[PDB]
Each structure stands twice: as structure tokens, then as C-alpha cells.
Amino acid sequence: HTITNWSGTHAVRPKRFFQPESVEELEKIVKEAHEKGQKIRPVGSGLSPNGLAFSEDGMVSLALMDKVLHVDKEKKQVTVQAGARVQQVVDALRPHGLTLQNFASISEQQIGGFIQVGAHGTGARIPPVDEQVVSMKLVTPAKGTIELSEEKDPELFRLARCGLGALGVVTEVTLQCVPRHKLLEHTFVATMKEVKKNHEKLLRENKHVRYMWIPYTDTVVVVTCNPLPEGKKAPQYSEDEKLQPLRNLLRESETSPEVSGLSFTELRDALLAVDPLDTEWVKRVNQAEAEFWKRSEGYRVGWSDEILGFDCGGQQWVSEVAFPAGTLEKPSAADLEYMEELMRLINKEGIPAPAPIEQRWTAGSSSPMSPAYSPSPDSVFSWVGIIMYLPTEDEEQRKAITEAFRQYRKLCETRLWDKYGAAEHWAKIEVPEDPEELEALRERLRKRYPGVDKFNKARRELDPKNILSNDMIDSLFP
Template sequence: MVALLRQTFVRAAGILLRDSPVTTHQPHVAKFSQATEAVRNIIQGSHAGKSSGHRFGGSPATPPSKFRIILARVLQIGLPISGISCLVYAFTHPDSEPLVPTRMPPQLQYLAAQQVDNEQVITNWSGTHQAQPRRLFMPESEAEVEVFVRAAHDAGQKLRVMGSGISPNGLGLSEEGMLGMALMDKIVDVNTEKMQVTVQAGCRVQQVADALKPYGLTLQNYASIRDQQIGGFVQVGAHGTGATLPPVDDQVVAMRLVTPAMGVITLSKQDEPELFSLAKVGLGALGVLSQVTLRCVPRHQLLETTSTATVAEVKKNHKRWLQENLHLRYMWIPYTDTVVVVRSNPLQATSNGSSKGGHAPAVTQNTSSQEDRLKPLRDLYVSRTSAATPSEVQGLSATQLRDELLALNPLNKEWVVKVNLAEAEYWRLSSGQRVGYSDEILGFDCGGQQLVLETCFPVANSLAEVPESKSRDIEYMENLLADIKRAGVPAPSPIEQRWTSGSSSAMSPAAGPPGGVYSWVGIIAYLPQSPEEREKITDMFRSKYSPLVQGRLMSKYGAVWHWAKLEVDERGGAASSSAAVQKRLAARFPVKEFNSYRSLLDPKNVLANEWLDKVLPRA
């Protein structure tokens, strides 16, 4: 508004004062000064005309009319007043749109980044890894991504793409150059006939779920949290749980990659199927994922049943639970005989919203109050902390209480066992059911910042082939729990176990036939705020806890790492060295083919970082 007023005023002054026209391409301050000078010249000229018959000291001219003299005097007084008014208005009513674009073109952004280093430090969600990249860019469009990637390629400079920073191993970080995708968060299209959604890679999972609600659609499965960007969600091979449901990368129908050497390419099962299979879990190494089309399912409600069971009860019922439940999740509590069993199944609704048979299923309400459920954890906290009072813990959730309890003595096994026993009692008292939509039910509170090591391994070629007893996934857990006890590891709760079917993505940890059953198991260690304690816990986790998994168990069960939780750390011994990691990955994945495409699409290796060069080095 202010800009429009200024332009209109200055142009009017230029027209009225024809002796000194004002050009509109000059800055507004210059226009205003020029208009003022024009008025001054006219006034001076009118006086000079009376005495000499000349205007502006030039050739003789007709003296100005009385009307123009009066107008000039009015403008002489009015211009300063109007100018001051405009300035006051401008300061009190800023323009909704800037007069000068605030965002530089991407080419200039890259040139500027060559001259001035970025000062922002990027930290992943767990606070376990950070980087201060020399160059940091936040593109708003695929075209900008292409400019940045091409500029990095031409200069031979690293440019690593990063999503939300959820990955515990910081696989998206780089000290040289980084590309954040948060501003590319548009829902491009929702196709209700095909039941597909096309989104930019920076969209968060919850944003996509919310956008699908009005269309009666949702994503096929969800991981524990909703903060991931879709690009990272897909590229690392994230997963939910359900023995008949694949990891999220298998929901990808089509994708657009921005590559350093070949620009933007579109991939699908029909277009470049081999590259498409590799790129769905591409780790950001084959190109920057800018847009993806995902398969959807009708939006549905789930009935979630939470209960506790002994290890013997789990072994007895495991195959039946896998077969009968669309979603199944176990939370094993070390040093106890308690396993939390979470089962979720769709409500079979009719077109009028009622369940089949006309009656909603019976929902077993939990009979324990929230106060009763939290009491074991609260009592333990108050008993250990002499300065604490019950009122200080009233507002803390179960996971927050667990974090606070563990922080009191995180490396003392006896104390951790007490915390685990209190949590087991909390879950026993929390048994019950709830109903909600799948995007609400399938998420859960993971607790605070943590170290995570998660592996995936095959269980059976089909659900029917899962044995009634001695199933590989249950044996894996029994061996792990026994090793934890034998080594005296202060292992907190829970150790989470989930399942998926096989994935058609060649680089997925669950790559295999669609009917295959794969189990995912994650061990954790919670991190307090104290830097000294964090370092001690990290050292314990890397040198004592992780080797229990990365040594004998991974070899015995043919397990590989979840890509976002793979750390190369010599503290874990030979099994976690670069050489051992590379050997295991080469035995499981088509690494040679993957790196061949990397050489074709990114010949200068600009999309890699230190982590990628350690785990999947190119020859």
C-alpha cells in the first residue's frame, strides 16, 4: 500500500511538473528527491522568468501561467508535509510485500556461500551428532534444488541432503555443504481414484496424514513418530509394524530425483525399474528426492489392545498373534519376565459408520486410574530423591518419569533393574483398549534423547511357515536378554520388536519376497542432559551393549542394520569397524550395482558425506 501511494504521488508530481519528469525505475528515495528538486526549479524559474524571461538559465521561454505558479507554491509546501506523512505511515504500517525481493536467486545464494561461511550448527534430534556446514541452503522449489546440486557438481563440492534430523546416526549431516528440504513441503496432488498422494519431499508425515483426511485416505502404515519428512522417511527405509505390511519405501509409486550429472529424472516401476528399486531406499546418494507419489489406503479406525505377558506366554501365542493381528508390537523389559504386547486391528465399519453387525466392538476400559498407573514410578522417584516431593512429579508422564529415574544412576545395573520393574508394573496396570484412527493409534511416545541400535532379520518366507515353537524372532530375543544378563549391561526398557513383510526396494533391510516375514529389534540407552554422563553412557552403549548385537546375533540370524541407526564406531570392536560393516552390507545388498548408479548420476561424489563414504565407499 505504501509503495503504491509513493509511486502514484511521485508520478503525479512528475506529470504536473513537466519540466522535470520522474523515471519510475529509480529507487523511491531518488524519485522523491527528484520531484522535490523539480518543484524548486519551477518556483525559481517562475521568479527568474519575471526578471529575465528565461527559465532555468536556458533559452527564452514563455513565463509560467498564474495557475502553474500557484500550483508550484502549493506543492512546495505540500511535498514536505506529504513526505513526512508517508514516512510516518510507512513505519507504522509496513508493506505486506517487500519492495525489494528478500530472497536471492539460487545462483547468487551459492556464490555468496562461497564467500561467507555458514555459522549455524545443525544437530540431530537425539543430540548425538552435529555439524556446522560451510554452505547451507534451503530450497523452495525443485528448480532451486537443481541449481544448488548443479553448482556443487560444477565446483566439486559436497552437498548432503537432510530431512528432519530424526536419524540417531546423523546420516544427513556434513561439515562441507548441506541442503535442508523443510521449505519444500507442499501437497502436490491427491488422486482419490488411484488412492495416491503426491507430495514434495519436505512434507512431514503428520502433514500428509492431515491432508489426506478430507479425502477419506491415509498412509498404509506409520512409524512411532510423525515428525519425519517424507523424503527421509522413505530414503532410510523406515517402517511401522505388521507382518503383512511392508516398510514405507514399498508404498512409493513414483519419485523425482535431482541428480548432479543428469538433472531431474522421474522413476517408477515402469520407468527405469532397476534404478527405481535401488533409489527408493537411496540414502540421498543417488540424487536429492524432490517429489514422491505414495500409495494410500482408506482411512480407518483401529482397536488397540495393550496387555502384559510372560515370556512363556509370548512363546506359546506368538504365531497366532502374528497371524491374527494387522499390527503387533512387543516391548521386552530386561531383567523381568514381562513383555508388553500391543495389538491393533481395523474396526470393520459399514457405509453408515457402524461396525459389521450394527454394533461397535466391546472396548475393555482400563480400570486403573492414571494416578494408580503412575504410582510405582512416582514412588520410586520420591524414595530415591530426598529433596523431591510428590507435587514435583505430578505433571510427568510415564516416559518422562522413566527418563528422570534413569538419569539418577544410568550406569548402575541394580538401579536400572529397579526402574525396569517399576515400569513393568506401570504397564501391567495400563492394560486395556482404545479406539482411534490409524495415524493416531500407531504412534507412541519414545521418550527423550537416546542412542539406538536397530537391526532387521528374516523370520520366515511366509506367515504360514512361522513355526509354532522356536521361531527365529523369539529365539533372537531370548538370546539377547540372556546375553544382557550375563554381561551385566544396565539395559533400560523397552527393547522394542516389530515386524514387516518383505520390500521390493533392493536396499531395504527387509528386501525380499512380498510374503516374507521380517523382524526389527531395537536396543536403546537414554541420554541425560549432563555432557559428562552422556559421554559415559555413549561409551557403555558402544563398547558393551552394542557388541552383544553386532557380534554373534547379527551373524547368527543374518541381520543388518536399520540405515538410520548404523554407526561405525571402533569402540564396538571388530564387528562395528568400517571393514566389517562394509563386508556385511555387501553380503546383503547389491552394493556394486548401487555404486555403479552413483558413479553415473553423481560422478564427483558430491552427495556423499563421511558416514556414507565409510559404509558404502566407492571404488
């Protein structure tokens, strides 16, 4: 049984692979692996871009433990087995009139894997998902099955719920839901100047805001979503006219066959496949994409779970950092300054950077390991995601792009992250081979994360034989 991540950038053939159907079966596996000193890294859907959950030695999946256990109608709360995919939870909650406060760009993540990395959506007043956990059960190699909440060892709770699978196997999570509700989604394009003008008010007056930045253009795609006051309503280009700049650029007879079945994101892939690391060509692809978005202005209505998802396109390298951008009441220009510099940087160095650079916002988290950890609840973090696509399975083309991206992320590390106090998404952080880079990263982590000594303390205590951790965890936290 091989496990491969979403983008096929990491795979693992674990010597031992468990898939219990019950807590009792899980408890027994962890007791025996404790006794025998055998590795058992928790794995959810295995999607993490950086293979965080992977172990050559042993992995345990709770995929078969995926029921909604309890819905507290009054407090709008759901208790669910960790192996439930976010999508299974949404479907289950449908009849009870509830949804999650936020969704990621996909919903194939297990609830366990979702909370253990502090995954997030967008909305300057909405925390990452780890802040939405009211309680959890956790099978530990030292103390068996323990229960954590604000009431029950609140300090361990806040450490554990965003634990990177290093503190125990989550079996059960209770989540603070909200009423199931429709969103009105408004997509429109702006210039940086137009973005700057309205930004401060836009974040604060719209429930969800997302900017898709298009390198080597002055097109920013703005997507706002707000609840629809019950029974409210809402140029207009065909699909063929929207896709026309991309089809014309690919065909370069008058027409296009086979191509016409390709979606917007499949066209971008086929276009980048042509000369992925040629900047002049990527400038041409990003311009064609800007034209597509300019022809895609308008409104959509759907349940929040349908609206808050995004087509992320083909296999890819991603890097996403969270950095402080003030609070609700004291705005910071840092989120827009970061993007100015990032665009200036990409031109300065001729980076063949495709679109989009995704920019989102979350409220702060009380979880000490959250990239958006803050002591103040009304802090605001901007998250900025850079991307390079792997549009084919040409092993040589994928190697060149892997290196291209390594240097792109490396230029953001050296020039921006320290300056802006940026922390890497736990599912997207890669471990340097160069020990100078590796020490540098550990130094960066001690800077971002003050409670790192408490995380290792909690590991010694709950996982003394260290069967829950892999080379990644040990290399990041020694």
C-alpha cells in the same frame, strides 16, 4: 545455522546450507554444485540417530517444498513434494479420506528422509515405506531431473527410492495410500511362555503387533491394533495408581510434589538419571515400569495416524536390526529365539539395559538397500530395537552412557547379528573408528546386501563428482 538430531548425539554447522522454494531453484543449486565440485548432502528434518544426512561442507533441505501436488482419488495415491513432513501429509490427506499404510513411532520425518532409509512401522503383512512408493522425481548431478517408477527404469527406481541421499535429491514422491480408518488398540502384558504360545497366530490374525520387552522381568507388553468394523465398541486404575510404583521408587515424603507433573517417560528418565549404569538400580526401575504396564491393560480407539504413534521418551541411543523370520505360510521361531538369547545375553553380562526393547514386524521389501530386502513378497522380518536413555545433559554422564551403549550394541553384533542375518537400520548404524571393526562392518554389509556393487555403480553414473555423499557413505561403501 546448526542442525542437531533428535537425541542431540550429533550436530553439524554446514559451511553451505540451501533451502530452495522450487524445483527450478533446486535444479540450479545441483547444476552449480556439480560444476564447482561442491558437497550438497540432502537433509530432511535431520532426526536420524546416526546423523546420516550431516555434512561439514554443504547440505540442501527441501523443507520449503512441502505441498501435496495431486491426489488420484481412484487409485488411493498422493503425489507430494519430498520436504512435506509425514504429519503434513496425514493432515493434507484428512479431507480426501486417505492415510498411509503404516507410520513410524514419530511423524516429524520429511517424506524424502522417511523413504531414503527404508523406515518402517509394524504389521507382518505391511512392507517398509520404500515399498509403498509408486513413483518419484530425483534431481541428479549427471542427468538433471529424472522420473522413476515400476514403468520407468524399474531397477534404478528400486535402488533410488531407498538411496540414502547418495543418488539424487528427491523432489516428489507418489505413495500408495489406503482409506483413512480407525484402529482398536489392545494393550496387555504376558510372560515369555504366554507370548510363545500365541505368537504365530497373533502376527497373522492382527494387522499390527508390537512387543515391548522389559529386561530383568518376565513382563512383555503386547500391543495389537486392528481396523474397527464401523460403529463397534471395546481392573481399571487411575493415572495416579498407574504411576504409583515409579513415584514410590523415585521418593526413596509419603506424597510427591513437582514429580506429579512428570509423565510416565519423564519419571523413567528421572529414575535412570539417579544411577544410569548400575544394573541393580536398573532392575528396580524396569520392575516398577512392568507394574505400570500391568496397570495399563485395555483398549483405545483413534485414527490410525494417532494410534500408531508411540511416546519414545527422552533423548537416547538406539540400535535396530531387521532379520528374516520366514514367510506368512512357513513360520520361523527365529524372532522369539533372538529375544531369548538377547535377554540371556543381557543377564550374562550385567548390562544396565532399560526398557523397552521394541520388537516389530514388516513384510519384505523389493528395494535392494532395504534391511528387509527379500525376493519373496510374503517374507516376514522382525525388527528389534535396543535403547539406553541420556536422561540429563551432564556431559560426563552422557559420555559414560555412550560407551555403555557402544558395548551393549557391540555384544549384539558379535553374538547375534551374523547368526540371525541381522541388518542395521540405515538411520541407526554408526561407523567404527577402529579399522578392524570398520572392515568387519563392510564385510557384514557385503554379506547382508548383495546389490552393493550396483549401488556404487549407480553413484558413479548419477553422482560422478560424488557431491551427494559424506564421510559416512564413503566409509560404508568404498
